[PDB]
Amino acid sequence: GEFPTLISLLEVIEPEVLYSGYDSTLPDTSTRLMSTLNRLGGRQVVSAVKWAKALPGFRNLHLDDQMTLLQYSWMSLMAFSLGWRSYKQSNGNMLCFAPDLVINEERMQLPYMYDQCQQMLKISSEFVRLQVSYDEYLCMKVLLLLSTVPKDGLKSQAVFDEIRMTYIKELGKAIVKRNWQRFYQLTKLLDSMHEMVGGLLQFCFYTFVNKSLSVEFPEMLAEIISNQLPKFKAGSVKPLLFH
């Protein structure tokens, strides 16, 4: 027979790019822009729950574990994909949040935008610097989902460890499909994602609690952010680093 490759499977469960429906006819405010991004983000996260579910192995975790991983890593998954789309669609020059919603120079210049957009372009330019391939990206994306765990560790740490084993192998296969040196670089990029995202989480928590700014969040994200917020205060959240 010949089981289809795990790469080929990842390729087909990769979600299709969502659409913002952003109306560039009305005037650009920064509360408006951020509230849009959050709404779009809400949708991307739903799209990412579907993806995780179709993910060979993911389902064998305890439901607590699936929660924990999706809660702890959503912002990384989203920023990673964003970085990818910006890499493809504009070669890392502009944030391509959707095809109907790109960030240009007006709207990076809007209040609050420049800082946060700088950080997300950093992610983008890594893909540029390392000429990352689609297959490399897909495996790295799975490893991102599996990169943050409670300091307590997970319930079914058993299954957890074997899942990482698989996708680390998969990452290696992908490196090949496109040479010892490469795997180092990539696991270093995975490592450096924790820092690159920490800033985004910080600003996110700010716009979430700052009542004056009237940045709206979909109930999807709000529920996650509200749950995550005491856990980051306690600092009870462990990055898995390769180095």
């Binding site: 739903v46 579910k53 439901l63 809660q71 109930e219 996650i224």
Partner: peptide, 11 residues
């Protein structure tokens, strides 16, 4: 527990 997320996982 994030009710919508939990929900999406249990369907």
């Amino acid at each position: 527990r994030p009710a919508i997320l939990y929900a999406l996982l249990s369907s």
